[PDB]
Amino acid sequence: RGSTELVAIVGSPIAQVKSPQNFNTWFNHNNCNLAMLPIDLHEAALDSFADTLRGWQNLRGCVVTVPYKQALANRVDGLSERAAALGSINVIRRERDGRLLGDNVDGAGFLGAAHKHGFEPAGKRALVIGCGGVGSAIAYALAEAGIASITLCDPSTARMGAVCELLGNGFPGLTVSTQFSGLEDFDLVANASPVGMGTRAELPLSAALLATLQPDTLVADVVTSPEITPLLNRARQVGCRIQTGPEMAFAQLGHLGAFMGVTPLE
Numbered sequence: 001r002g003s004t005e006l007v008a009i010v011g012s013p014i015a016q017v018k019s020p021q022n023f024n025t026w027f028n029h030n031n032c033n034l035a036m037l038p039i040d041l042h043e044a045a046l047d048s049f050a051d052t053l054r055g056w057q058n059l060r061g062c063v064v065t066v067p068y069k070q071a072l073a074n075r076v077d078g079l080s081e082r083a084a085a086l087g088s089i090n091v092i093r094r095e096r097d098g099r100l101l102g103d104n105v106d107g108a109g110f111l112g113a114a115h116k117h118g119f120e121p122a123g124k125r126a127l128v129i130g131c132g133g134v135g136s137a138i139a140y141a142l143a144e145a146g147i148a149s150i151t152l153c154d155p156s157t158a159r160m161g162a163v164c165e166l167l168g169n170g171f172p173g174l175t176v177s178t179q180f181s182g183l184e185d186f187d188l189v190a191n192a193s194p195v196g197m198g199t200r201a202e203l204p205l206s207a208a209l210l211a212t213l214q215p216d217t218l219v220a221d222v223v224t225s226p227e228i229t230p231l232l233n234r235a236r237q238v239g240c241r242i243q244t245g246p247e248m249a250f251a252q253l254g255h256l257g258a259f260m261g262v263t264p265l266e
């Protein structure tokens, strides 16, 4: 245990995170001398933390969760192309020399789960509800994967316009829109908003729109609790394939580990 090499996950609060048991469970099952530990870091210590990471010689990497995805993107030494475009990371690899490299794999995680549900993005049409950190990562991953069309929804005009711009000038051969009157023509409908969370879970879409939901569509949600949101419950009742927040989170563990150099792509 004195010689165990480490990864970590940093955020605040941290007690709710599931990466540690998930990574450790895996570490144990394949007899790895590795462990993931949780770090609930106070925001005042961000700069100290980045510098501690550089000097932390037996640490391989560090997952980043709320609310430090943007803050740490700005404090690492290097960014992947997507991370740079998104302005946020959820994973850091520490090089042997101490350089911090960051990436954002929320998008890849989402695609991974989608693939298992038989969804191939090339040439399709998606609706992304929520233009936040996770929503932009998802839209951006869809675009890179060759989706034909992305339609966006967010009460925040500023954030919707920022994702319009990200996509518009990242992918000239991609049609973007913020206007639609039904769900009939989406191959994928993805909730990337907080709407759906918790024991009083609500729906991000009006009943009128939901009534237009078609069976052949994949309906996906990023929310982790409940696993089955009112959105997914209705989609399932209509016969759509559904993808859950836990599925997306789990499909990532595979990418986080590889970026940290601790787990294979799997």
Ligand SMILES: NC(=O)c1ccc[n+]([C@@H]2O[C@H](COP(=O)([O-])OP(=O)(O)OC[C@H]3O[C@@H](n4cnc5c(N)ncnc54)[C@H](O)[C@@H]3O)[C@@H](O)[C@H]2O)c1
Binding pocket: 106, 109, 129, 130, 131, 132, 133, 134, 135, 153, 154, 155, 156, 159, 192, 193, 194, 195, 197, 204, 221, 222, 223, 224, 244, 245, 246, 248, 249, 250, 252
């Ligand atoms: N499953 C996973 O792996 C996973 C990973 C990351 C985040 N999440 C979850 O994703 C959700 C969002 O995370 P975030 O980090 O992106 O937060 P965020 O705040 O950055 O972004 C959320 C966006 O939702 C928008 N929004 C709110 N109400 C909306 C509505 N009715 N319709 C459309 N858009 C609306 C907000 O304006 C905001 O832009 C949270 O529930 C988070 O817990 C899940």
Ligand SMILES: [Mn+2]
Binding pocket: 030, 031, 032, 033, 034
């Ligand atoms: Mn091993």
Ligand SMILES: [Mn+2]
Binding pocket: 129, 152, 153, 154, 205
């Ligand atoms: Mn919408």
Ligand SMILES: [Mn+2]
Binding pocket: 152, 163, 164, 165, 176, 177, 178
């Ligand atoms: Mn647009």
